[PDB]
Amino acid sequence: MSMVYMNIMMAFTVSLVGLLMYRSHLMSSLLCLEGMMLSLFVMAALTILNSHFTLASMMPIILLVFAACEAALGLSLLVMVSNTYGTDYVQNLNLLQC
Amino acid sequence: MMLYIVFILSVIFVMGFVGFSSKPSPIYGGLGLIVSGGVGCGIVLNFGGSFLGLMVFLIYLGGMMVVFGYTTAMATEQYPEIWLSNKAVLGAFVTGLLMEFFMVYYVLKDKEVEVVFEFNGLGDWVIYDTGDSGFFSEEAMGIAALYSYGTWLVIVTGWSLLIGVVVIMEITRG
Amino acid sequence: MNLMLALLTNFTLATLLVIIAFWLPQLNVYSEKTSPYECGFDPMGSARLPFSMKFFLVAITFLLFDLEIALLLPLPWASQTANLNTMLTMALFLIILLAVSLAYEWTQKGLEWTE
Amino acid sequence: RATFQFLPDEARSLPPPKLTDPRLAFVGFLGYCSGLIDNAIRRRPVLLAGLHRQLLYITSFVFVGYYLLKRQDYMYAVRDHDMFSYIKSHPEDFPEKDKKTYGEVFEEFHPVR
Amino acid sequence: PGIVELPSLEDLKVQEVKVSSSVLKAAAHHYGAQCDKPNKEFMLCRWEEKDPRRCLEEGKLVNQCALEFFRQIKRHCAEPFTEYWTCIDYSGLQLFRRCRKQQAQFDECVLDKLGWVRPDLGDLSKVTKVKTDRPLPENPYHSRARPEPNPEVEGDLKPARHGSRLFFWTM
Amino acid sequence: MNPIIFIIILLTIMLGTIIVMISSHWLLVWIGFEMNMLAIIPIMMKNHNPRATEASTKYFLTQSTASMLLMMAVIINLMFSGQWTVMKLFNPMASMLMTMALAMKLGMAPFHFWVPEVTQGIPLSSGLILLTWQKLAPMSVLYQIFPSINLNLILTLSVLSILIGGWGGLNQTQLRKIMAYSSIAHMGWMTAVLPYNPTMTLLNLIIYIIMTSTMFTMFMANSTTTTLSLSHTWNKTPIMTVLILATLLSMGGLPPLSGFMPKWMIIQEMTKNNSIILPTFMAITALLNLYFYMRLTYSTTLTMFPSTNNMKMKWQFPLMKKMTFLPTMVVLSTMMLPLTPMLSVLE
Amino acid sequence: PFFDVQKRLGVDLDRWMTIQSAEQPHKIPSRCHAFEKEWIECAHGIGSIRAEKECKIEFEDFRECLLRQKTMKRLHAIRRQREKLIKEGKYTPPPHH
Amino acid sequence: AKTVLRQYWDIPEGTECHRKTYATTSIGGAAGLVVSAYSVALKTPTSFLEGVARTGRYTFTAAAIGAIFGLTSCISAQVREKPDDPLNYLIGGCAGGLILGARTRSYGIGAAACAYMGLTAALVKMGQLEGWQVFAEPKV
Numbered sequence A: 001m002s003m004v005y006m007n008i009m010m011a012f013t014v015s016l017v018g019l020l021m022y023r024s025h026l027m028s029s030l031l032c033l034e035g036m037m038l039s040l041f042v043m044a045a046l047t048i049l050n051s052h053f054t055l056a057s058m059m060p061i062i063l064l065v066f067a068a069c070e071a072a073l074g075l076s077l078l079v080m081v082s083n084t085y086g087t088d089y090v091q092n093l094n095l096l097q098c
Numbered sequence B: 001m002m003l004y005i006v007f008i009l010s011v012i013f014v015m016g017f018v019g020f021s022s023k024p025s026p027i028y029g030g031l032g033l034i035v036s037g038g039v040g041c042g043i044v045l046n047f048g049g050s051f052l053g054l055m056v057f058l059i060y061l062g063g064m065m066v067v068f069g070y071t072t073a074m075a076t077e078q079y080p081e082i083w084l085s086n087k088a089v090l091g092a093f094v095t096g097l098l099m100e101f102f103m104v105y106y107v108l109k110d111k112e113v114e115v116v117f118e119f120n121g122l123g124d125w126v127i128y129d130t131g132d133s134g135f136f137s138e139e140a141m142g143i144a145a146l147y148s149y150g151t152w153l154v155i156v157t158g159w160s161l162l163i164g165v166v167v168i169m170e171i172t173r174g
Numbered sequence C: 001m002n003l004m005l006a007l008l009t010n011f012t013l014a015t016l017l018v019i020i021a022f023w024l025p026q027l028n029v030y031s032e033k034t035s036p037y038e039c040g041f042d043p044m045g046s047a048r049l050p051f052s053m054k055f056f057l058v059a060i061t062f063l064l065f066d067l068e069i070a071l072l073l074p075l076p077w078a079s080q081t082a083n084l085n086t087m088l089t090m091a092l093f094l095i096i097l098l099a100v101s102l103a104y105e106w107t108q109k110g111l112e113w114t115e
Numbered sequence D: 001r002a003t004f005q006f007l008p009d010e011a012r013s014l015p016p017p018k019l020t021d022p023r024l025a026f027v028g029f030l031g032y033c034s035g036l037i038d039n040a041i042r043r044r045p046v047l048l049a050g051l052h053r054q055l056l057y058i059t060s061f062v063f064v065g066y067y068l069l070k071r072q073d074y075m076y077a078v079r080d081h082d083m084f085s086y087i088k089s090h091p092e093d094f095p096e097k098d099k100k101t102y103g104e105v106f107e108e109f110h111p112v113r
Numbered sequence E: 001p002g003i004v005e006l007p008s009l010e011d012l013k014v015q016e017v018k019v020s021s022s023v024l025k026a027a028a029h030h031y032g033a034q035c036d037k038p039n040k041e042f043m044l045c046r047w048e049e050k051d052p053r054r055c056l057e058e059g060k061l062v063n064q065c066a067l068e069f070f071r072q073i074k075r076h077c078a079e080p081f082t083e084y085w086t087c088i089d090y091s092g093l094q095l096f097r098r099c100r101k102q103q104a105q106f107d108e109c110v111l112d113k114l115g116w117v118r119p120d121l122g123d124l125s126k127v128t129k130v131k132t133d134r135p136l137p138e139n140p141y142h143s144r145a146r147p148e149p150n151p152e153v154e155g156d157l158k159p160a161r162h163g164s165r166l167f168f169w170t171m
Numbered sequence F: 001m002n003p004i005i006f007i008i009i010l011l012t013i014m015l016g017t018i019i020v021m022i023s024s025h026w027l028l029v030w031i032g033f034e035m036n037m038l039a040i041i042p043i044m045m046k047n048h049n050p051r052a053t054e055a056s057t058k059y060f061l062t063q064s065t066a067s068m069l070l071m072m073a074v075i076i077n078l079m080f081s082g083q084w085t086v087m088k089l090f091n092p093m094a095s096m097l098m099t100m101a102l103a104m105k106l107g108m109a110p111f112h113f114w115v116p117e118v119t120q121g122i123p124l125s126s127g128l129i130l131l132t133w134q135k136l137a138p139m140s141v142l143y144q145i146f147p148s149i150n151l152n153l154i155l156t157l158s159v160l161s162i163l164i165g166g167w168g169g170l171n172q173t174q175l176r177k178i179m180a181y182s183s184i185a186h187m188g189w190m191t192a193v194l195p196y197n198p199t200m201t202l203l204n205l206i207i208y209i210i211m212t213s214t215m216f217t218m219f220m221a222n223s224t225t226t227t228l229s230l231s232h233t234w235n236k237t238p239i240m241t242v243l244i245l246a247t248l249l250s251m252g253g254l255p256p257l258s259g260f261m262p263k264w265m266i267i268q269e270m271t272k273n274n275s276i277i278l279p280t281f282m283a284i285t286a287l288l289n290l291y292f293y294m295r296l297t298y299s300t301t302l303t304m305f306p307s308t309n310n311m312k313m314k315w316q317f318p319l320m321k322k323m324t325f326l327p328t329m330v331v332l333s334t335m336m337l338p339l340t341p342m343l344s345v346l347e
Numbered sequence G: 001p002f003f004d005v006q007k008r009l010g011v012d013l014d015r016w017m018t019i020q021s022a023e024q025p026h027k028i029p030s031r032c033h034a035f036e037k038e039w040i041e042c043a044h045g046i047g048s049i050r051a052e053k054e055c056k057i058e059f060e061d062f063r064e065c066l067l068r069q070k071t072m073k074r075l076h077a078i079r080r081q082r083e084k085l086i087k088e089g090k091y092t093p094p095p096h097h
Numbered sequence H: 001a002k003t004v005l006r007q008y009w010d011i012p013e014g015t016e017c018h019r020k021t022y023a024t025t026s027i028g029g030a031a032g033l034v035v036s037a038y039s040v041a042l043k044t045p046t047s048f049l050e051g052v053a054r055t056g057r058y059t060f061t062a063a064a065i066g067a068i069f070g071l072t073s074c075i076s077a078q079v080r081e082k083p084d085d086p087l088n089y090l091i092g093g094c095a096g097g098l099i100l101g102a103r104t105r106s107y108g109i110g111a112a113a114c115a116y117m118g119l120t121a122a123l124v125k126m127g128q129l130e131g132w133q134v135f136a137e138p139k140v
């Protein structure tokens, strides 16, 4: 494939690894989720734009809309996690082992 | 050198991703996502999608403004971590750049590269269309069709956004 | 090119002004001068401590509302369609659902800040 | 054959299940058992209570079961219609054998000593 | 997979119409009326044939008519036309509405001297019919033969033989 | 939650699932999953306690991750075929990513860790939706993409799910965690037969849903969530202990009960394709599920556990719970084996 | 679709955007319109199992149009052979190039 | 795994034992690493050094079981001049079980391993001989 795809696919993989390798802050992982969607938007936009798939030009826009619904949903849960424990640390969410 | 504009921007795209993927303080992660969103807009714009590029930049600037506010409220510590402050963050950061730098070095040297899958390094312009002379933007025609062809898409997206408001109100009412 | 040249010139002009600002004046740095400002007395606690956000729910709603305008900004182009019956119905439909969501959040006291 | 149709039109050329179908009698019986369980979980006299309710359990089960049995029969008719037509379309894959008798075919004998 | 057949550089030679877009735009409406026939025969050819190599001859007649059309203007209405497209060329958008006065002078000149009538609003966007002696292409996509359909299953739906035949079930 | 808001949110959970099942376009399939995920989270958080918050967070992170892998597969598929039709995929890398994406959505092993924890952290009514309705959409996609799925990958997930589900349930005293590991074990049977006969995947899916709905409804009827709390049922409602016994023996796959039907038809399809070792291994490993079903029947119906004095107060009040469809569901869960040939309705 | 309500009701929900050779606004064609049309018409009605082998030629051409991997391989080879002769002093490009 | 598995099955039973032992060791070592990775990921080691210690302990145990099975099964075949006899893998399988028992300091594990590994290995050779399919390709 064209060389641009090497870096966009690489960017998606970097964010996927960033998502799967947690640290403490839950906000940091939510950012990696937003980054994953950004690479998908760009990767989809390139294909659609380059192939002149006219009606598919709206598809990346629709992608962003449900990205915001996910980010808003993620932030809502972060608020509740923060209220319970006073931090957004993911090590506090370990009550359900038992 | 200018013929490789999309490649150069895409290199910065990855560098911004390594930025926030190594997960320093979310303040700096948001900075890395803004840079990537900025150059990502530049990449898409160079393929003829001025509206798509500017829109994704505009959305992500608004999103990272909220993330900034939430960070100072709910994701801050006494000593927020930069990329150099933490050994795990620095190791991921350096590893990302070295993996990136070696992909660039070899794809440029050979005009091709095998990184799992084969990528051609002739420059991204070679795949472009050769014959355009319409009196409109094809991206604008495709996007505007959402309101004539995408009735079903309009309904499900509009409904999901309304439900989204209802849901976040429910989720955060302790 | 013109665009990249214009951006480079603006941000280079700003950078030069900062370089002059730091290297031209005579400096005298000591601990008390560079201490954090708080009206004459030393701060109590780090400025990095959490700062509660009382408008957190409006902030999340902004994300959803800020995506609606991405869906609406194509409307000037959509008005050039021949199928104006469908386009006008879906345009009004989208804006009304935005208004309904606003009215819901308003009536449910989502726009009032937490006290 | 018709896309997303419970009972295509061609299914009407098959005979409908009889109303005395043994399978349908069993389905009606399951409805009767459901009615009894309904009384028991709610601590009502199992056999006597709510005969109107018990009647509707039997009737609803038989009603739904009749259509399921009709589609069941239809799908097996379709399977055979497909299978036989395919055999006709490909004779060389289903050739008729020459049937030897047991006086000609040699089978080995294994004594049970 | 084959050699792409390209016309020789000799076959691609024709006397070009070397005028600027402002000149073309200033003469567009009359050119649309005067050179309709070869133009619409070239555009039928391109859309039917779907191959630039298959319409070169029609392309040249488009060029030849253009040169003949512009030579008539040069002979009879050079100065009024030069004023008109000079006005068009000034505009960054090459707008018609800034040069109605010079357009009127050009229009009346060609009308008087050549009987040229300007097409009305909507005329040049009409779909027209064109008579051609070129044969309609047979396989413009160079399609291979389509694979044969699966043999159709037809007959009378009979009850399944001995029912479901699932294990012990008799129905 | 306002009752009207609860109904609107529930209907949106169903609408997202329906969209997935009726869509011919990969983008609308992805939208259906996203709409479904958005609506279910408030049902998880309905009681607002730290365990519900933890459960919803773990659920959101898992489902959101799966959707990104799902959309990655769709875009890779678009590059290599230029279309969006919901059908076989045209790139093996896309097939793997989509297959993993659906495995995480279903909670198949080794992507299973969230299922026991999320189920434990949410009420019983929400757990019922999670372990039943939420399986429909991912399975409906596997039903359409299976011709391009890697056989080794899908059978590996099925094998691991049956083992981990069976082993995981042996150590559980919490009913919601017992149902969760049971669901993982049953997911494996559905996908194991998918490469050979998708019709048998639907049959197992339908019968699993009926039996799982029956159990959850009976747990809700008595507000029981632990083994010991359920062991008091013989002293409140004796009839409910017999229904639990019959249903649990059915989930164990014992003839002549209905739950034997899917295990039986799956073994038939696998043997027709010369797969002998795998169904044998699967049937024996399902004995682990029978073991910890049998423990529940012992503590619930076949013995009488100690009671408390305050239990006498409950004798004087009737069951008020709706228990919708429980009489029908329990009969279907148990007495359906004679009608096995009716599986052709799903063909 | 798992349930084909769109066909039963004859309503078009999403199949208008499934393929790039479907009707576009202002009849703007995709770049691979002809290739995908040829592939779709070759494979129509015969099923994927047959279409995988009997329409291989059409699909391969369509794939080449989409990703252009064979063209880029060809151009990469010519460009390589040119630099081989430039350094070796064995070829001078023409003025027009 | 397909490449290493193919190599083992491409050199005839009882011939070139050293090559066989490399294949079974390669399979064993990979299995041990897979076990270490999940173990380290899901049960965090207290120190980086210990996590390395756990990794080496599992990878060596796994590789030993592979090498001894490959050595025993080939040497038994060559000695007995019975290349295609399932019994050879039974000897190799049990020997592996003993190595596992030794590495665990548990006779009971060693006893059970020698049995179940013995049967399982012998079952694999019969499957190769008779073409038993574990992940059988769909056909009907």
Ligand SMILES: CCCCCCCCCCCCCCCCCC(=O)OC[C@H](COP(=O)(O)OCCN)OC(=O)CCCCCCCCCCCCCCCCC
Pocket (backbone or CB within 6 Å): D022, D023, D025, D026, D029, D032, E168, E169, E170, E171, F256, F337, F338, F339
């Ligand atoms: C279920 C009864 C047995 C109880 C013990 C459980 C045994 C193991 C259960 C596993 C399934 C094994 C069932 C074996 C029989 C199924 C095969 C079969 O019976 O053939 C198909 C059957 C039609 O039977 P057929 O041979 O045609 O005889 C007609 C007589 N009029 O058509 C059918 O398949 C339906 C027959 C199912 C058998 C039960 C229904 C028989 C009808 C009596 C229903 C009760 C009616 C009375 C209602 C009383 C209400 C209080």
Ligand SMILES: CCCCCCCCCCCCCCCCCC(=O)OC[C@H](COP(=O)(O)OCCN)OC(=O)CCCCCCCCCCCCCCCCC
Pocket (backbone or CB within 6 Å): D033, D036, D037, D040, D044, D045, D046, D047, D048, F239
């Ligand atoms: C032609 C008919 C042949 C019968 C086939 C039976 C097959 C099993 C059907 C299962 C459904 C049974 C009905 C649901 C149970 C409800 C009955 C109950 O809960 O208790 C018994 C009850 C009498 O006690 P009471 O609660 O005080 O009510 C007063 C009404 N006289 O009510 C009664 O008076 C008795 C009601 C029936 C009792 C059933 C006892 C349990 C049977 C299950 C054992 C398994 C069945 C055999 C397996 C082979 C199947 C053929």
Ligand SMILES: CCCCCCCCCCCCCCCCCC(=O)OC[C@H](COP(=O)(O)OCCN)OC(=O)CCCCCCCCCCCCCCCCC
Pocket (backbone or CB within 6 Å): D027, D030, D038, D052, D053, D054, D056, D057, D060, D061, D063, D064, D065, D068, F323, F324, F325, F326, F328, F339
């Ligand atoms: C696969 C082969 C086997 C075939 C399996 C077939 C299964 C599907 C068949 C349907 C199964 C459910 C049948 C339930 C029958 C009992 C209904 C009943 O007696 O209700 C009594 C009464 C409510 O009845 P009512 O709503 O007034 O009647 C009008 C309905 N439109 O008030 C009551 O007390 C009812 C309370 C007990 C019922 C449980 C709660 C459910 C509520 C149901 C409401 C009524 C539904 C009507 C069913 C009609 C189905 C055709």
Ligand SMILES: CCCCCCCCCCCCCCCCCC(=O)OC[C@H](COP(=O)(O)OCCN)OC(=O)CCCCCCCCCCCCCCCCC
Pocket (backbone or CB within 6 Å): D040, F237, F238, F239, F240, F241, F242, F243, F245, F246, F249, F256, F257, F301, F302, F330, F331, F334, F335, F336, F337, F338
């Ligand atoms: C049909 C062909 C297909 C074949 C498949 C098999 C069909 C059978 C499916 C069964 C469906 C479940 C319904 C079973 C009905 C059982 C009725 C019953 O148990 O009697 C009710 C009684 C409840 O007590 P109560 O309501 O309060 O009455 C006064 C006594 N206190 O109960 C009690 O008080 C008992 C309390 C003590 C518990 C004793 C438990 C041992 C007896 C269990 C028998 C039922 C086993 C069912 C399992 C399947 C059997 C094959």
Ligand SMILES: CCCCCCCCCCCCO[C@@H]1O[C@H](CO)[C@@H](O[C@H]2O[C@H](CO)[C@@H](O)[C@H](O)[C@H]2O)[C@H](O)[C@H]1O
Pocket (backbone or CB within 6 Å): A009, A013, A016, B117, B118, F076, F091, F092, F093, F097
């Ligand atoms: C969770 C993982 C996160 C990382 C995700 C990364 C996604 C990257 C997607 C890249 C997709 C590349 O897909 C891969 O392309 C090459 C093209 O040479 C194909 O290559 C193969 O098929 C084509 C023709 O069919 C030919 O080149 C040849 O037969 C063979 O090399 C592979 O069959 C395909 O699988």
Ligand SMILES: CCCCCCCCCCCCO[C@@H]1O[C@H](CO)[C@@H](O[C@H]2O[C@H](CO)[C@@H](O)[C@H](O)[C@H]2O)[C@H](O)[C@H]1O
Pocket (backbone or CB within 6 Å): B001, B002, B004, B007, B008, B011, B012, B104, B108
């Ligand atoms: C904050 C850090 C940001 C890091 C950004 C990293 C950007 C990535 C570097 C990309 C560099 C691209 O480098 C580009 O390679 C091609 C190789 O053909 C060169 O192009 C070359 O083509 C012809 C070949 O016939 C040569 O004669 C010519 O002299 C040369 O220009 C460009 O001159 C060069 O600019």
Ligand SMILES: CCCCCCCCCCCCO[C@@H]1O[C@H](CO)[C@@H](O[C@H]2O[C@H](CO)[C@@H](O)[C@H](O)[C@H]2O)[C@H](O)[C@H]1O
Pocket (backbone or CB within 6 Å): C084, C085, C086, C088, C089, C092, C093, C096, C097
């Ligand atoms: C919460 C859900 C809220 C949903 C609210 C939906 C409100 C929709 C109101 C109707 C909007 C469109 O209203 C409708 O527009 C079309 C064209 O635009 C009009 O149509 C009129 O103009 C068009 C062309 O422009 C002609 O084809 C038509 O003959 C003529 O009648 C209709 O006369 C008018 O009834």
Ligand SMILES: CCCCCCCCCCCCO[C@@H]1O[C@H](CO)[C@@H](O[C@H]2O[C@H](CO)[C@@H](O)[C@H](O)[C@H]2O)[C@H](O)[C@H]1O
Pocket (backbone or CB within 6 Å): C095, C096, C099, C100, C102, C103, C106, C107, C108, C109
């Ligand atoms: C189609 C778009 C144009 C249509 C308008 C769409 C937006 C509608 C906004 C909400 C309308 C009803 O919802 C809203 O309910 C709250 C009740 O708490 C009322 O708000 C009430 O308290 C707030 C704060 O003190 C004040 O606005 C006001 O003093 C009082 O009315 C609003 O008066 C009413 O407007």
Ligand SMILES: CCCCCCCCCCCCO[C@@H]1O[C@H](CO)[C@@H](O[C@H]2O[C@H](CO)[C@@H](O)[C@H](O)[C@H]2O)[C@H](O)[C@H]1O
Pocket (backbone or CB within 6 Å): H024, H027, H028, H031, H032, H035, H057, H058, H061, H062, H065, H066, H069, H070, H103, H104, H105
């Ligand atoms: C032909 C190919 C043959 C391939 C053979 C593959 C054999 C399978 C090996 C699986 C990995 C080894 O399995 C692992 O071994 C180590 C041995 O220390 C065991 O470890 C156990 O015994 C010792 C001593 O107690 C310690 O390592 C450890 O504290 C304990 O848990 C693990 O409990 C077991 O899970």
Ligand SMILES: CCCCCCCCCCCCO[C@@H]1O[C@H](CO)[C@@H](O[C@H]2O[C@H](CO)[C@@H](O)[C@H](O)[C@H]2O)[C@H](O)[C@H]1O
Pocket (backbone or CB within 6 Å): F277, F281, H005, H006, H009, H010, H120, H123, H124, H125, H126, H127, H128, H129, H130, H131, H132, H133, H134
């Ligand atoms: C705890 C018990 C767990 C379950 C144990 C079940 C044991 C079942 C035995 C595994 C199946 C048989 O094992 C497998 O058989 C196939 C034949 O189809 C062999 O297939 C082999 O045949 C040829 C030789 O003809 C080889 O060159 C080739 O490498 C390979 O394809 C495999 O090399 C073998 O690994």
Ligand SMILES: N=C(N)NC(=N)NCCc1ccc(I)c(Cl)c1
Pocket (backbone or CB within 6 Å): D075, D076, D078, D079, F196, F197, F198, F199, F344, F347, H140
């Ligand atoms: N095995 C598959 N994947 N499909 C499948 N069920 N093939 C079997 C064919 C079949 C069987 C019964 C009927 I009734 C019908 Cl109509 C067709």
